[PDB]
Amino acid sequence: FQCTFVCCGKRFSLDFNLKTHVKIHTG
Protein backbone atom coordinates (compact mmCIF):
# COMPACT_ATOMS: atom_id res chain seq x y z
CA PHE A 1 0.00 0.00 0.00
CA GLN A 2 1.71 3.24 1.15
CA CYS A 3 2.45 5.24 4.33
CA THR A 4 1.16 8.74 5.15
CA PHE A 5 2.00 9.47 8.79
CA VAL A 6 4.60 11.69 10.48
CA CYS A 7 7.84 12.07 8.52
CA CYS A 8 8.09 8.28 8.06
CA GLY A 9 5.77 8.09 5.04
CA LYS A 10 7.30 4.67 4.24
CA ARG A 11 6.00 2.38 1.47
CA PHE A 12 3.66 -0.59 2.03
CA SER A 13 3.57 -3.72 -0.16
CA LEU A 14 0.58 -5.75 1.10
CA ASP A 15 -1.83 -5.92 4.06
CA PHE A 16 0.61 -8.03 6.11
CA ASN A 17 3.38 -5.48 5.46
CA LEU A 18 0.66 -2.81 5.71
CA LYS A 19 -0.17 -3.29 9.41
CA THR A 20 3.24 -4.76 10.23
CA HIS A 21 4.44 -1.21 9.51
CA VAL A 22 1.80 1.43 10.30
CA LYS A 23 1.45 -0.48 13.60
CA ILE A 24 3.89 2.11 15.01
CA HIS A 25 1.90 5.20 13.99
CA THR A 26 -0.88 3.28 15.74
CA GLY A 27 1.33 1.93 18.55
The yes or no reply on residue 20 touching Zn ion (CB under 5 A) is: no
Is 18 an interacting residue with respect to Zn ion (CB under 5 A)? no
Alpha carbon distance 27, 13 (integer Å): 20
**Which helix (H) or strand (E) is 12 found in, with range?**
none
**Among residues 1, 2, 8, 17, the one that binds Zn ion under rule CB under 5 A:** 8
CB of 25 to Zn ion, least distance (A): 6
Q: What is the C-alpha to C-alpha distance for residues 21 and 10, in angstroms, rounded to an integer?
A: 8
Binding site per annotation, positions:
3, 8, 21, 25
Interface residue list for Zn ion (CB under 5 A):
3, 8, 10
